[PDB]
């Protein structure tokens, strides 16, 4: 994470992130719609931070500090670079859409009127196919990754030392190897919950209600295809 | 401090997400009740034992039968949730949640939790249920279901008022420590 985005998403909601006089200028439905959008971006930020912990802290740490076969590290952290590139581009697009919506002279007061188009482009076409193929692979390799980590911790003492060091900071409390792997699997099932609650407060602009409805169906078609392509691997 | 894993299972609007958020925050969200729960690691001291309790949620996974089982590995305690204002959610406990939880998690303590107990004396909740020829889930019905499915225990709570929330998670920690 970068301090700019950590501070921008430090607040518990959009109502507490924007200035109090700025909040007082808007309708209740606007405050509710923006609170759910802010959360979609907040959790997307946390999702990319999780994927960076897996790539730079755990994965890269095991390559430089340990004498493990590169095929073993690939089994512990499958498709993490592809997932990192996929969601980093999405977070990028969500963060730019927030900066375009920013009030001139302010760095925290914003109202996003268009989100649907951003989601339709992410959850459709070749971008969605890349993501569907990536998550079907990740989730089919998820068990073998948990089992491989557990075998390495119950045979190698230098791997045990490495895990105690990297995860020692309080920052990594809920973010160990196995927690990160499950964090990445549960992520795709969060989107229809977020987009449905966003859609619920987007009945002002009609093109926007249709965009969020089109994206909602796109996320469900995608989830159904990731679920259909899962086929658990064994050691 | 021993690490133990908790997973909450149950139907869609049974309140499993609300419950986790209220426990992890300690209060009912004042300004914004979040939509989702990522994960949380709780420091609990039950009966003089210090435990690290990883809290997970299955909300969003209810329709994906090949994704959902990926939440179950290494579970030490299952909170089996149902809503007191929805007697239909209780009917699905022995038909859908119990066969699946017992298949992926053999020998894992299950605590049947009855969420939304405040709605048992709510006016609008009783009128709507009367149209469907029903009434809120009675304590004896929950106990009779926890007994029939072989649950470790039956507990009720309210995420809204926070009554009984601390006790469900403390009991879950005691249940996870059994071996
Ligand atoms: C652009 C902007 O920041 N406008 C604004 C309106 C009301 C109150 C405050 C502090 C700013």
The 8-class DSSP code of residue A149 comes to H
The domain segmentation of chain A, as residue ranges, is 1-235
Cβ-contact A235, A147 below 8 angstroms: yes
A contact set with B (CB within 8 A): 12-16, 35-36, 39, 43, 46, 139, 142-143, 146, 173-174, 178-179, 182-183, 185-186, 188-190, 192-194, 197, 223-224, 226-228, 230
Separation CA A145–CA A92 (nearest Å): 29
How many other C-beta atoms lie within 10 A of the C-beta of residue B111? Answer: 24
Query: Which residue in the block uniquely carries the two structure tokens 């994704």?
Result: B67
Residues 6+ apart with CB under 8 A from B112: B80, B82, B93, B142, B145, B146, B149, B151, B153, B154, B155
Interrupted after residues, chain A (C–N over 2.5 Å): none
Is A43 within 8 Å of B59 when comparing Cβ atoms? no
CA distance A38 to A8: 10
Which residues form the pocket of ligand 1, taking CB atoms under 6 Å from any ligand atom? A 19, 21-22, 25, 103-106, 109
**Tokens in use for B17?**
């997400």
Whether B156 contacts B123, CB under 8 Å: no
Residue with tokens 């089919």: A140
Angstrom distances, CA of residue B63 to CA of A220, A232, B11: 10, 18, 10
Distance CA A132, CA A73 (A): 23
d(CA A34, CA A8) in angstroms, rounded, equals: 14
3-state secondary structure of B4: strand
Distance (Å, whole) CA B98 – CA B92: 9
CA separation for the pair B74, B104 (Å, rounded): 10
Q: Identify the CA nearest to A107 among candidates A1, A13, A41, A22.
A: A22
Report how far residue A103's alpha carbon sits from residue A110's, in angstroms, rounded to the nearest whole number: 6
Method: X-ray
Distance CA(B46)–CA(B169), nearest Å, equals 10
Contact predicate A14/A175, CB 8 Å: no
Report the gap between the CA of B13 and the closest CA in chain A (Å): 12
Residue A176 burial (CB count, 10 A): 19
Question: Closest Cα to residue A189, out of A215, A143, A227, A144?
Answer: A227
Q: Which two tokens stand for residue A99?
A: 């900066």
Residue in this structure with the two tokens 């089109």, named with its chain if needed: A214
Separation between Cα atoms, residue A212 and residue B71, nearest integer Å: 28
- Among the listed residues B37, B10, B13, B15, the one whose alpha carbon sits nearest the alpha carbon of residue B25: B37
Site of tokens 């090949």: B66
Residue B108 phi, psi (nearest 5): -105, 120
Radius of gyration (C-alpha) of chain B in whole angstroms: 16
Both tokens assigned to B110: 């299950």
Q: Give the three-class secondary structure for B44.
A: strand
| Topology (CATH) of B3-177 | Rossmann fold (3.40.50)
Joined together, the tokens standing for residue A27 give 């309708």
Please indicate if any CB of chain A lies within 8 Å of the CB of B64. yes
**Which residues are CB-neighbours of A107 under 8 A, at least 6 positions away?**
A8
Q: Which residue has the tokens 């089996």?
A: B80
- For chain A, helix, strand, coil in percent to 5 are 70, 0, 25
Dihedral angle over CA of A133, A135, A141, A142, nearest 10 = 180
- Closest among B46, B41, B71 to B171, alpha carbons compared: B46
Indicate the DSSP class of residue A25. T
E strand map for chain A: none
Ligand 1 atom, smallest distance to A19 CA = 10
CA dist., res. B79 & res. B60, Å (int): 16
Torsion angle of alpha carbons B39, B7, B68, A185, nearest 10°?
A: 20
Give the mutation target among A15, A17, A18, A19 for probing the ligand 1 site: most ligand atoms within 8 A of CB: A19
What is residue B11's DSSP assignment? -
Resolution (A): 2.6
DSSP state of B138: P
A11 in Cβ contact with A17 (< 8 Å) = yes
Alpha-carbon span A42 to B57, nearest angstrom: 18
- Note whether A222 and A232 are within 8 A (CB): no
């Amino acid at each position: 994470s970068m301090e700019m985005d950590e501070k921008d998403f430090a607040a518990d909601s959009w109502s507490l992130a924007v200035d109090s006089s700025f909040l007082q200028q808007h309708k209740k439905e606007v405050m509710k719609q923006q609170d759910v959008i802010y959360e979609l971006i907040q959790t997307e930020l946390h999702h990319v931070r999780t994927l960076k912990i897996m790539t730079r802290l755990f994965r890269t740490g095991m390559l430089e500090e340990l004498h493990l076969e590169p095929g073993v590290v690939q089994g512990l952290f499958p498709c993490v670079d592809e997932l990192s590139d996929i969601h980093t581009r999405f977070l990028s697009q969500l963060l730019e859409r927030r900066r375009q919506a920013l009030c001139p002279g302010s760095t925290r007061n914003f109202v996003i009127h268009r989100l649907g188009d951003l989601l339709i482009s992410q959850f459709s076409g070749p971008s969605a196919e890349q993501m569907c193929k990536t998550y079907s692979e990740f989730c089919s390799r998820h068990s073998k990754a948990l089992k491989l980590y557990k075998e390495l911790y119950a045979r190698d003492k230098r791997f045990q030392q490495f895990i105690r060091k990297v995860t020692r900071p309080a920052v990594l409390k809920r973010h160990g190897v196995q927690e990160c792997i499950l964090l990445v699997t549960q992520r795709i099932t969060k989107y229809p919950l977020l987009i449905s609650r966003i859609l619920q407060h987007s009945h002002g602009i009609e093109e926007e209600r249709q965009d969020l409805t089109t994206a909602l169906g796109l996320v469900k078609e995608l989830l159904s295809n990731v679920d259909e392509g899962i086929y658990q691997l064994e050691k | 401090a021993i690490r133990k894993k908790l997973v909450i299972v149950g139907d869609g609007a049974c309140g499993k997400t609300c419950l986790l958020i209220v426990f992890s925050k300690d209060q009912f969200p004042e300004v914004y009740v979040p939509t989702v729960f990522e994960n949380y690691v709780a420091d609990i001291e039950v009966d003089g034992k210090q435990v690290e309790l990883a809290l997970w949620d299955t909300a969003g996974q209810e329709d994906y039968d090949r994704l959902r089982p990926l939440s179950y590995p290494d579970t030490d305690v299952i909170l089996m949730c149902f809503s007191i204002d929805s007697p239909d959610s209780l009917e699905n406990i022995p038909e859908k949640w119990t066969p699946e939880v017992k298949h992926f998690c053999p020998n894992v303590p299950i605590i049947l939790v009855g969420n939304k107990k405040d709605l048992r004396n709510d006016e609008h909740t009783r009128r709507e249920l009367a149209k469907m020829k029903q009434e809120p889930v009675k304590p004896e019905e929950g106990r009779d279901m926890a007994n029939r499915i072989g649950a470790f225990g039956y507990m009720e709570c309210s995420a809204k008022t926070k009554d009984g929330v601390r006790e469900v998670f403390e009991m879950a920690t005691r249940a996870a420590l059994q071996a």
